[PDB]
Ligand binder design. Structure first.
Ligand code: ZN
Lengths: 349, 371, 165, 266
RNA sequence: GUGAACCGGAGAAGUCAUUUAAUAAGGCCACUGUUAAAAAGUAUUCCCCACGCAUGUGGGG
């Protein structure tokens, strides 16, 4: 059972599949990817020029059957667009500014199923794995945010089960999902029902050429799917909003229990400030704590000097860095804290 | 060639700039709320300062007919001047036209000369009037700030077509953001009655708003566009640059200064000579907190020095070295106690800083160019 | 949140001498007046050893000082925005309400290190109306995650819900 | 093969792009409203730069547009956080005293500060076929565009706000299928006291790159990328099994590394 | 190489001027840290190195 259909994921921050009714400086768009637009995307991915497209490639690929499922409808967003500001414009020339207003779709995603010849689908997918040219979503200022070559080809019978095959991928966990997903699919005669129903509407996106752009109409129908029954909700990948590493804390750990022994050996079991016999070790340079402990930034200390340094660190600021003995600074405050500890701390506690 | 000045200035509790509701102006930078002083406020306070008085040769007014009458003496021409001003597409709403007009003060005598004589007709004189306002650009303040003026079209004389009446700005001034978080404060004030009565109440009760902050000021001057704005007057351009430095350093905006009097000097000035403008406002994307071991100004200067080092090491180009001077009074605040290498020269006197800036600019002396 | 409960219970168990010691240290650091440092270390250190979670040191210090100054019986269901809204509702709606609301809304702008006096004025307004309870556990939990946006959102929403009714 | 440049740039409060009403241009993403800079504004500001023109069939006609189809591709500059527009209340002043303390004009202007994410794409095959087999000039104009795009900004309202900032993170990658990383900032960046706006944006970019490297980009073909911050100001994924192949601390070194990969030219 | 490609909404600006939160006040009242104790001790000092019948001397920690 060789695969017979190809799936396209069309999702980007900004999208614009232009409609037939623009014809002027009001560049509009359609609610779904047009057939001519995705055909031009395919021809750009295969490296076929505009003149070369009109002879064989477009008539060959116009025999496929296409259906688009809506994953996210998006929001239509306009854009004021001036041309030739501070510069002349063609036709002789004129020092003038051209005003226009463009329309894009924002935060939208579509799934396109294109059933056809298995060799055609295989060659098309092979071309789409490494596109010849940069493929955008309608306009050149709309690059895709997801790989078009994402979903694998397969063999199915109807377009409804084809759009049922691919699960719906969820964003962040709180985000809700659409409950009724509209599918817009090409009308199929079947050679028995020769006359289309009255709900079938004409769209004008059957292409012939691209340099003298020519289109013909086609009958398009619109049905719907129910999520869960027809499309299973996929689960998001392992991800999170980036947070700075809050490190960890663990002394029971045997590796630190031996690093402190190495430190007490290497400073010869003596304090750095008052040179009394050492009791513990202060953990200066708290970065790389727990798993990447280097017995260099640690400094052995007695109980009174360690308590004084902890008193100084609890007061004032406190960040990943610490207060390091052997510094010529902070000596006077450490000695004052030593005096206060000696003359004020009560052992009855 | 561009001269860019970055300044750090801590202010006493005051309300130097405020919006329509009286609150001090704020902005959102780096996701955190900071205090702001609008750039036009700084530009006006420098422009209308005492230290810039020898260079003030332009007026931005709405009542030009009043100036025409006040410079024509006693001969009555005020209605006539208003009429000719209306003919060149300016309109008139009770002695003040609908638009502000920027023009050097030296050309009011010429306008008085055209308005006085009845030898010429009306409409042609209006055209002549345009030719004086389109060429009254030889002022230091017009050269610095820049002027654009577009007159009306529904009441023009059809024979008064205008020349080019714009001047590109030779000075870019940023909005003075704060290096730390915003801390707005409310001062609950009362106003008492000098005459005793029955009750103990006072005349008025209200609340004002004030805040104290450390501001980061950024200015940029384009020397080539400056000397083009004054038509090759390099001497006058250098005089403007020196007077502008003195006024910017030694003047503060006069907002609510009779009740707060926050006349604080800057604690650090960095003057750089470049070819492309760079702003060090991203030094304080992380707001400046306070540690007991230091203070606000020293921490701000250290953060600025760290970001300047980052910028210089990450955007070094052997084709365009950058020469900068650091100024602090009597070298109180150096450029951080970590590098001692981002300042090509350390200056402790403001006058010496201005003289060195002028000597780098063109080799002139200050006392030569002051007149 | 059991560590916060143990912290608050140990705070209520305090005698009057160390309460006065903490009262004398309002607005101060942790590096001076050694008896305060020793008392705070005795209060806070056993929480980390047994309980894996523990309130932040700055939050715990602020809570201890505020409890020393403004001794309140800990009771579940007496969060600060709800009591503040109940106080604000019985006010003159033209002059006093904007002032007191501005003093309340000043709080949701700073960090932990500068909330002492803006919280002390709030506790003074509470003590003016003779309160007898305050949810120290909920206030500590909210103050711990003060940088999360839904925390401030729920703080303001609870205040508005208590104000409106 | 395709070259892709991703850019993170915080801007001081300004109005770098306007519309018919003066407001900064915005867009919609992640369920919220983000600030935006239109792609044609960035392309024009890159193209007409005097330092760019004085630096380098014409190289600008080969890279940009005028069937001559450009290999350049500039996307709309979305923002990694919720937009925050603001109104500034300006009052004009009169130097001539009158009967009252009138202004002369009263109004409101708009400004906004944002940390924009920029995406760029250069098609090497179209570029080399545009210049008829030439390669050294193609690498030269690629480097020229890299320096220009790293050191340029739009001129909108810059006489009043002066937002002459510099980028704080650049990521240059080589791969075949074009994918942008705007999906990283689907969740808007919310600041914390332990990080910056730029730091969190760079970290979220690193997280998204790590997740997609663990996913679609299998061992079919390795992906070569270079990460740059000034003087190693910000790391993209500290260690993390070397998510970025290199860490660079000067623009010239990144330009040389990219040139030496693409052709070995210097 | 897509109703596509080539494609700035830009230029100008101070929210200013005026002001006391004033007037009254006690944290008071009651309290034993008490009960018991030698700084003494010879039967192998915790370790290096020169000689000996001594039933140990010398130097080092
Ligand atoms: Zn010690």
């Amino acid at each position: 059972a060789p695969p017979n259909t190809l799936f396209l994921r069309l999702e980007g921050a900004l999208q614009s599949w232009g409609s037939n009714e623009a014809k002027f400086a009001l560049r509009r768009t359609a609610d779904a990817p047009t057939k001519s637009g995705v055909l031009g995307l395919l021809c750009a991915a295969m490296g076929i020029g505009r003149a070369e497209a009109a002879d064989s490639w477009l008539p060959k690929l116009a025999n496929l059957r296409m259906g688009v499922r809506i994953d996210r409808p998006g929001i239509r967003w306009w854009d004021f667009h001036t041309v030739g500001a501070g510069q002349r414009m063609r036709m002789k020339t004129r020092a003038e500014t051209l005003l226009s207003r463009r329309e894009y779709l924002a935060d939208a995603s579509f799934l396109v199923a294109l059933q056809g010849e298995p060799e055609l689908v295989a060659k098309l997918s092979a071309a789409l794995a490494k596109p010849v040219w940069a493929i955008y979503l309608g306009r050149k200022s709309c690059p895709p945010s997801r790989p078009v070559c994402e979903h694998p080809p397969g063999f199915y019978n109807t377009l409804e089960e084809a759009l049922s095959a691919v699960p719906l991928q969820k964003r962040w966990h709180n985000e809700p999902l659409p409950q009724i997903l509209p599918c817009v699919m090409d009308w199929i005669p079947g050679y028995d029902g020769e006359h289309a129903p009255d709900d079938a509407e004409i769209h004008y996106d059957l292409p012939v050429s691209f340099q003298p752009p020519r289109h013909l109409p086609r009958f398009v129908i619109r049905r719907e799917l129910v999520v869960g029954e027809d499309v299973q909700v996929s689960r998001e990948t392992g991800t999170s909003v980036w947070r700075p590493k809050g490190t960890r804390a663990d002394y029971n750990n045997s590796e630190y229990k031996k690093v402190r022994a190495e430190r007490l050996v290497m400073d010869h079991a003596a304090c750095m400030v008052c040179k009394a016999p050492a009791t513990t070790v202060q953990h200066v340079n708290y970065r790389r704590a727990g798993g990447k402990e280097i017995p260099e930034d640690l400094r052995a200390l007695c109980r009174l000097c360690h308590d004084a340094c902890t008193m100084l660190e609890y007061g004032s600021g406190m960040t990943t860095n610490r207060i390091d003995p052997c510094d010529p600074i902070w000596r006077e405050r450490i000695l004052a804290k030593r005096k206060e500890i000696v003359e004020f701390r009560s052992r009855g506690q | 060639m561009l001269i860019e000045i970055h300044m750090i200035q801590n202010h006493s509790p005051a309300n130097l700039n405020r919006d329509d509701l009286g609150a001090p102006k704020t902005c959102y930078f780096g996701g955190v709320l900071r205090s702001r002083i609008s750039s036009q406020c700084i530009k006006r306070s420098i422009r209308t300062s005492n230290d810039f008085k020898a260079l003030l040769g332009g007026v931005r007014t709405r009542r030009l007919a009043d100036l025409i009458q006040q410079e024509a003496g006693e001969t009555e021409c005020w209605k006539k001047a208003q009429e000719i001003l209306n003919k060149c597409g300016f309109k008139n709403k009770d002695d003040n036209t609908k638009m502000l007009v920027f023009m050097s003060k030296d050309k009011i005598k010429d306008l008085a000369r055209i308005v006085l004589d009845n030898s010429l007709g009306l409409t042609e004189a209006a055209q002549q009037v345009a030719n004086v306002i389109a060429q009254a650009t030889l002022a230091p303040d017009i050269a610095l700030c820049g002027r654009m003026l577009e007159p009306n079209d529904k009441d023009k004389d059809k024979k008064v077509k205008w020349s080019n009446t714009t001047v590109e700005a030779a000075l870019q001034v940023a909005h003075a953001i704060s290096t730390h978080i915003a801390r707005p404060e409310i001062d609950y004030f009362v106003a008492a009655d000098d005459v005793p009565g029955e009750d103990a109440g006072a005349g008025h009760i209200g609340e004002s708003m004030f805040a104290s902050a450390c501001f980061y000021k950024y200015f940029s001057i384009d020397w080539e566009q400056l000397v083009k704005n004054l038509k090759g007057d390099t001497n006058l351009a250098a005089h403007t640059v020196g007077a502008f430095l003195l006024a910017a350093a030694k003047t503060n905006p006069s907002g609510k200064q009779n009740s707060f009097a926050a006349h604080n000097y800057p604690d650090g000035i960095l003057v750089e000579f470049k070819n492309s403008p760079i702003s060090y406002a991203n030094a304080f994307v992380r707001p400046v907190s306070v540690v007991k071991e230091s203070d606000l100004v020293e921490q701000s200067i250290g953060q600025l020095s760290n970001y300047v080092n980052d910028i210089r090491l990450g955007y070094y180009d052997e084709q365009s070295p950058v020469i900068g001077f650091w100024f602090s009074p009597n070298n109180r605040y150096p450029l951080g106690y970590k590098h001692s290498k981002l300042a090509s020269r350390n200056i402790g006197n403001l006058n010496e800083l201005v003289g060195a800036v002028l000597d780098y600019i063109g080799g002139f002396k200050w006392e030569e160019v002051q007149k | 949140n059991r560590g916060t409960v143990d912290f608050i219970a140990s705070l209520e168990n305090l005698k009057e001498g160390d309460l006065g010691i903490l009262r004398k240290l309002r607005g101060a650091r942790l590096d001076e007046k050694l008896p305060g440092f020793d008392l705070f270390s005795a209060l806070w250190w056993p929480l980390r050893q047994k309980n894996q979670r523990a309130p932040k040191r700055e939050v715990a210090w602020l809570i201890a000082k505020l409890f020393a100054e403004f001794r309140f019986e800990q009771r579940e269901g007496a969060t600060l925005p709800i009591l503040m809204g109940g106080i604000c509702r019985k006010l003159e709606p033209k002059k006093e309400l904007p002032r007191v609301l501005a003093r309340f809304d000043q709080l949701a702008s700073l960090d932990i290190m500068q909330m002492e006096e803006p919280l002390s004025v709030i506790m003074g307004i509470l003590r003016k109306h003779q309160q007898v309870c305050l949810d120290w556990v909920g206030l500590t939990d909210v103050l711990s995650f003060w940088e999360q946006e839904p925390v401030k959102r729920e703080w303001s929403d609870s205040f508005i819900k208590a104000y409106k009714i």
